[PDB]
Amino acid sequence: RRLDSVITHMSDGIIATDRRGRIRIVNDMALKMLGMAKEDIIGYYMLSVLSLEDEFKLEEIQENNDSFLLDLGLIARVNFSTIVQETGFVTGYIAVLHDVTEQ
Ligand SMILES: [Zn+2]
């Protein structure tokens, strides 16, 4: 439920969305990796921002477990997850961007 055991690091880009997959939180690291200003990110579709709209749909996130390599210069491993409330209802989505040269 509320506890997502998705693996995350201090240096990770993090993006969080609403139910429509529109970005509502993005940290400094994610902006850095994307090479984009917060103003061009907040409120835009996460999958558009990640250049995935051709490849991936929001519907797939829940039943998906696969992480993907993405060119953002930087090669990131992206892992998507759902944000789920107490009653099992999905409230939004998370992308975790791991720099491939991490650790
Ligand atoms: Zn990481």
- Which structural domain, as residue segments, surrounds residue 93? 1-103
- Cα(16) to ligand 1 centroid in Å equals 16
The dihedral of CA 29, 33, 37, 39: what is its sign? negative
CATH number at residue 55: 3.30.450.20
Q: Based on the structure, what is the number of domains in the chain?
A: 1
Those residues whose C-beta lies under 8 Å from the C-beta of residue 80, and which sit 6 or more positions away, are 61, 64, 93, 94, 95, 96
Tell me: is residue 9 an annotated ligand-binding position.
yes
Q: Are 61 and 82 in contact (CB under 8 A)?
A: yes
- Cα(82) to ligand 1 centroid in Å equals 17
Tell me: is residue 102 an annotated ligand-binding position.
yes
Q: Could you tell me the CA-to-CA distances from 57 to 22, 63, 67, 84 in Å, in that order?
A: 13, 12, 14, 18
